[PDB]
Amino acid sequence: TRAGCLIGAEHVNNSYECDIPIGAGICASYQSIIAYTMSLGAENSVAYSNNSIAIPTNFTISVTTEILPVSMTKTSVDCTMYICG
Amino acid sequence: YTMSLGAENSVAYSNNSIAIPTNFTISVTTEILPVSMTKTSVDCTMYICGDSTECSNLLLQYGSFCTQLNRALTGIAVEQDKNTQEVFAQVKQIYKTPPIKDFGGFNFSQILPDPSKPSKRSPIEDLLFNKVTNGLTVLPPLLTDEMIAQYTSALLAGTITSGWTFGAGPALQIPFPMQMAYRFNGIGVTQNVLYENQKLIANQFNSAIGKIQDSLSSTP
Amino acid sequence: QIDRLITGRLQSLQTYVTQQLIRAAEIRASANLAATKMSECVLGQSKRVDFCGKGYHLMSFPQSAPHGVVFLHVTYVPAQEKNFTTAPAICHDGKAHFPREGVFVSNGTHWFVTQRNFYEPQIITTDNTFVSGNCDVVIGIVNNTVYDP
Amino acid sequence: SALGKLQDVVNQNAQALNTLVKQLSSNFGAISSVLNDILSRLDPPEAEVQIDRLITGRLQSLQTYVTQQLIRAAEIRASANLAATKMSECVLGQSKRVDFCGKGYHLMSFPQSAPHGVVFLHVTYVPAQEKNFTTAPAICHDGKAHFPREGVFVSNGTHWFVTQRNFYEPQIITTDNTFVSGNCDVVIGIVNNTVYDP
Amino acid sequence: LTGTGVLTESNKKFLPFQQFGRDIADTTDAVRDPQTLEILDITPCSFGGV
Ligand SMILES: *[C@@H]1O[C@H](CO)[C@@H](O[C@@H]2O[C@H](CO)[C@@H](O)[C@H](O)[C@H]2NC(C)=O)[C@H](O)[C@H]1NC(C)=O
Ligand SMILES: *[C@@H]1O[C@H](CO)[C@@H](O[C@@H]2O[C@H](CO)[C@@H](O)[C@H](O)[C@H]2NC(C)=O)[C@H](O)[C@H]1NC(C)=O
Ligand SMILES: *[C@@H]1O[C@H](CO)[C@@H](O[C@@H]2O[C@H](CO)[C@@H](O)[C@H](O)[C@H]2NC(C)=O)[C@H](O)[C@H]1NC(C)=O
Ligand SMILES: *[C@@H]1O[C@H](CO)[C@@H](O[C@@H]2O[C@H](CO)[C@@H](O)[C@H](O)[C@H]2NC(C)=O)[C@H](O)[C@H]1NC(C)=O
Ligand SMILES: *[C@@H]1O[C@H](CO)[C@@H](O[C@@H]2O[C@H](CO)[C@@H](O)[C@H](O)[C@H]2NC(C)=O)[C@H](O)[C@H]1NC(C)=O
Ligand SMILES: *[C@@H]1O[C@H](CO)[C@@H](O[C@@H]2O[C@H](CO)[C@@H](O)[C@H](O)[C@H]2NC(C)=O)[C@H](O)[C@H]1NC(C)=O
Ligand SMILES: *[C@@H]1O[C@H](CO)[C@@H](O[C@@H]2O[C@H](CO)[C@@H](O)[C@H](O)[C@H]2NC(C)=O)[C@H](O)[C@H]1NC(C)=O
Ligand SMILES: *[C@@H]1O[C@H](CO)[C@@H](O[C@@H]2O[C@H](CO)[C@@H](O)[C@H](O)[C@H]2NC(C)=O)[C@H](O)[C@H]1NC(C)=O
Ligand SMILES: *[C@@H]1O[C@H](CO)[C@@H](O[C@@H]2O[C@H](CO)[C@@H](O)[C@H](O)[C@H]2NC(C)=O)[C@H](O)[C@H]1NC(C)=O
Ligand SMILES: *[C@@H]1O[C@H](CO)[C@@H](O)[C@H](O)[C@H]1NC(C)=O
Ligand SMILES: *[C@@H]1O[C@H](CO)[C@@H](O)[C@H](O)[C@H]1NC(C)=O
Ligand SMILES: *[C@@H]1O[C@H](CO)[C@@H](O)[C@H](O)[C@H]1NC(C)=O
């Protein structure tokens, strides 16, 4: 690889999502350990033309989670007691 | 000298007069934002001591300082890849433009990828890449420049062929002079103004894109 | 002597790692800003002033850069403005008429209604105006006819 | 691994505390890492030197710990300012900002308390089951160009309708949902269709 | 001048008064052999992270 030499992983020609990052587009996964070039996303060719539009006929009410940290543990260290007791 | 903030512009205010625009300029501006740094890793033991075993034996008296430095650098290195992942990988569908570039007079050749170049970059992106010039290791970024260019190509194809619909769900195709009219209505200007003056807006947009390329090529 | 060299090099390495952490925090803040601009200027049209360029934001285009991103903000800038005489409301038949979406303008002799960001004069009708109250309340109301289709 | 962001902060703080406790076991070049052993073994002229080595090692460790604690405090403060912005704009209102309050067109949001954190349940509207239609920018009728007030002209193959943009609801093209601007000679791609007048 | 490295042939033509060679980072990367006046590049011994 461009990151270096990888020993113990079988290089495959298929592209999957990145499980364990190696670097320079190389990722590793377990299925034995395989190494591959990652696949960014599913290909999708938009049917563009100058007089056609796509209009939705239905909808999905989708609820998603977003986790955000707010605070940490309030830690205090007695400097004199830590250094000297 | 004493500097001057700006030129004086006394606005002609009165209680019954208004100023209404009769024309418009399609203006394209550049904004450059850094995303990641060079991922550097330092072998602390080799940096302090090299191959001297007595130095490492004396360095073991100081404890796990080297482990903390390596872990902090590892956290920075994975934070750069997380930053690139959050910036560029906002779509899971790789969109392509149609082979026929009939967008109602709008030209995107300076921002779409060039098929003649092996790096698959746009001319603007190629100019941007041309304008940027002991225990130490440099880890390569997880996303290569080809895949970052592929992500930007997918984003450009989505925003050209599908509007803002691909960012909120499935990519719904729409003609570009209609997409533009929708954007005009988003800023409070009627669709008719866009439709009647579509040739002038396309010419202004192409001229502004060319001025962007000229200004990037002419400013160090 | 090796202990002196060790503590000097360790102090140098701690200084380097500390300033690298500070620069990493700054770059993370800049990258969060860049991801926000990617979401709000490229994947949609933003109403936020000067967030996606100078002027009324139309669209934006992303471009890759070495360790960075370049946003081409395509915006709408008004130009060639013209003076007009304006009024808050039109008094007609003892009723006050207010524009539904535009603004009342006058070129000197005749009164029209136009959209706010572009001069497009139209005849003041009952389709683009609405009625609220009489003419005795609004300060600066003027007398003009309101054509009924 | 759903709650990995809070657990990462908890693990980093616990690991920093464990490293700070572990640094007391190092002698930093002195004869011992225990202060009582030095004070019971040596005269004060050389115990001063040994205690000085222990003091400078432990002080360097404590200053390092306080340095990454301040850096992590800045990061957590930035995350908390972001969380307060999401609480103000997604929960207390409806946000027009794309992907700020979930994927899709944001409808509303719910806050949930979490150990040292917040979880936003973003309820969003996703379009689905899209269908092709043949579209035109304007309708030519009686020598006049008609444009939709809020919707879009669509055609299923034989008949022309106007619909709202985010949901298929075809309606008859009338004068009540269209407005007239100019003739048919200027707009590129204008098509001929009748406009019903109520 | 002592060290550890791989000593390869060098294309750097020294002036006759010069003995060692340094890069930007003040590391000895070129040297002259004292027995036979020839120039040798000193590549550092291969190392990397595991
Ligand atoms: C709208 O019409 C276009 C073209 O008629 C459809 O696009 C084709 O879809 C099929 C089905 O997957 C593909 O095999 C073709 O390659 C597509 N053509 C192009 C040019 O992209 C599209 O699927 C239609 N939309 C809907 C919702 O049915
Ligand atoms: C829009 O999508 C919904 C799914 O969310 C459809 O509702 C389903 O309809 C089928 C058949 O009518 C039922 O068997 C399912 O039980 C329904 N699901 C739910 C959750 O109620 C709905 O029919 C779709 N409408 C259109 C016009 O396509
Ligand atoms: C609208 O009218 C005002 C007032 O007549 C104009 O303001 C004057 O502009 C000239 C030319 O720059 C100045 O010399 C005067 O000092 C201005 N007067 C005031 C009171 O500001 C204004 O230029 C007109 N706008 C347009 C677009 O014609
Ligand atoms: C609005 O401004 C544009 C310029 O942005 C004007 O277009 C110019 O018109 C003149 C004469 O009609 C031509 O000589 C130029 O070549 C045009 N420029 C471009 C870029 O096309 C336009 O005429 C203005 N419209 C109004 C009503 O003032
Ligand atoms: C879109 O823009 C490109 C670039 O401005 C145009 O390509 C130019 O075409 C002319 C004549 O065809 C050549 O003399 C130039 O050398 C071309 N420039 C480049 C950079 O290739 C292109 O014609 C425009 N229109 C379309 C439909 O692509
Ligand atoms: C204000 O605008 C109106 C409408 O454009 C002008 O009225 C027209 O003026 C022309 C020129 O004399 C006449 O040929 C038309 O018959 C008028 N139309 C109507 C309906 O009366 C008016 O002259 C403008 N006023 C100023 C001061 O510019
Ligand atoms: C606008 O119209 C109103 C109503 O016709 C005018 O109000 C009248 O003004 C005259 C003269 O001052 C009075 O004698 C009437 O009693 C008023 N009638 C009412 C109902 O108030 C008003 O003067 C007009 N304004 C302008 C500027 O023409
Ligand atoms: C497009 O939609 C219109 C409206 O539903 C269709 O017109 C109706 O079609 C049905 C089916 O035969 C007839 O029974 C109705 O009488 C029609 N209504 C009118 C007002 O003519 C039309 O058939 C659809 N076209 C296509 C190609 O699907
Ligand atoms: C839409 O209707 C207009 C108006 O009838 C058509 O324009 C006419 O076209 C014929 C032949 O092309 C000419 O002889 C007339 O002089 C035109 N009249 C006008 C006012 O322009 C137009 O062709 C129609 N378009 C379609 C697609 O049916
Ligand atoms: C506007 O100002 C003029 C004097 O400058 C005054 O006569 C007129 O009544 C004012 N109109 C309003 C609505 O304040
Ligand atoms: C759309 O493209 C076709 C050719 O593919 C052309 O005949 C037609 O005029 C175009 N319509 C518009 C509105 O550009
Ligand atoms: C050392 O001896 C070798 C062979 O005897 C000779 O080639 C070389 O030039 C000598 N070096 C000097 C500095 O005399």
UniProtKB/Swiss-Prot annotation, chain B:
Changing residue 22 to I: In strain: Alpha/B.1.1.7. The chain holds residues 695 to 942 of 1273 of the full protein. It comes from Severe acute respiratory syndrome coronavirus 2 (2019-nCoV). The record marks 121-122 as: Cleavage. The lineage of its organism: Viruses, Riboviria, Orthornavirae, Pisuviricota, Pisoniviricetes. Disulfide bonds join 44-66, 49-55. This is Spike protein S2. Glycans are attached at residues 15, 23, 107. Precursor of the fusion protein processed in the biosynthesis of the S protein and the formation of virus particle. Mediates fusion of the virion and cellular membranes by functioning as a class I viral fusion protein. Contains two viral fusion peptides that are unmasked after cleavage. The S2/S2' cleavage occurs during virus entry at the cell membrane by host TMPRSS2 or during endocytosis by host CSTL. Changing residue 137 to N: In strain: Lambda/C.37.
From Swiss-Prot, chain C:
The lineage of its organism: Viruses, Riboviria, Orthornavirae, Pisuviricota, Pisoniviricetes. This is Spike protein S2'. It comes from the Viruses. The chain holds residues 992 to 1140 of 1273 of the full protein. The gene is S. Glycans are attached at residues 83, 107, 143. Disulfide bonds join 41-52, 91-135. Subunit of the fusion protein that is processed upon entry into the host cell. Mediates fusion of the virion and cellular membranes by functioning as a class I viral fusion protein. Contains a viral fusion peptide that is unmasked after S2 cleavage. This cleavage can occur at the cell membrane by host TMPRSS2 or during endocytosis by host CSTL. In either case, this triggers an extensive and irreversible conformational change that leads to fusion of the viral envelope with the cellular cytoplasmic membrane, releasing viral genomic RNA into the host cell cytoplasm.
From Swiss-Prot, chain D:
Changing residue 39 to F: In strain: Omicron/BA.1. It comes from the Viruses. Changing residue 150 to K: In strain: Theta/P.3. Changing residue 8 to N: In strain: Delta/B.1.617.2, Mu/B.1.621. Changing residue 159 to Y: In strain: Theta/P.3. Changing residue 176 to H: In strain: Alpha/B.1.1.7. Disulfide bonds join 90-101, 140-184. Residues 7-51 form a coiled coil. Glycans are attached at residues 132, 156, 192. Subunit of the fusion protein that is processed upon entry into the host cell. Mediates fusion of the virion and cellular membranes by functioning as a class I viral fusion protein. Contains a viral fusion peptide that is unmasked after S2 cleavage. This cleavage can occur at the cell membrane by host TMPRSS2 or during endocytosis by host CSTL. In either case, this triggers an extensive and irreversible conformational change that leads to fusion of the viral envelope with the cellular cytoplasmic membrane, releasing viral genomic RNA into the host cell cytoplasm. This is Spike protein S2'. It comes from Severe acute respiratory syndrome coronavirus 2 (2019-nCoV). The gene is S.
From Swiss-Prot, chain E:
Changing residue 2 to K: In strain: Omicron/BA.1. Attaches the virion to the cell membrane by interacting with host receptor, initiating the infection. The major receptor is host ACE2. When S2/S2' has been cleaved, binding to the receptor triggers direct fusion at the cell membrane. When S2/S2' has not been cleaved, binding to the receptor results in internalization of the virus by endocytosis using host TFRC and GRM2 and leading to fusion of the virion membrane with the host endosomal membrane. Alternatively, may use NRP1/NRP2 and integrin as entry receptors. Binds to host ACE2. RBD also interacts with the N-linked glycan on 'Asn-90' of ACE2. Cleavage of S generates a polybasic C-terminal sequence on S1 that binds to host Neuropilin-1 (NRP1) and Neuropilin-2 (NRP2) receptors. Interacts with host integrin alpha-5/beta-1 (ITGA5:ITGB1) and with ACE2 in complex with integrin alpha-5/beta-1 (ITGA5:ITGB1). May interact via cytoplasmic c-terminus with M protein. May interact (via N-terminus) with host bilirubin and biliverdin, thereby preventing antibody binding to the SARS-CoV-2 spike NTD via an allosteric mechanism. This is Spike protein S1. The lineage of its organism: Viruses, Riboviria, Orthornavirae, Pisuviricota, Pisoniviricetes.
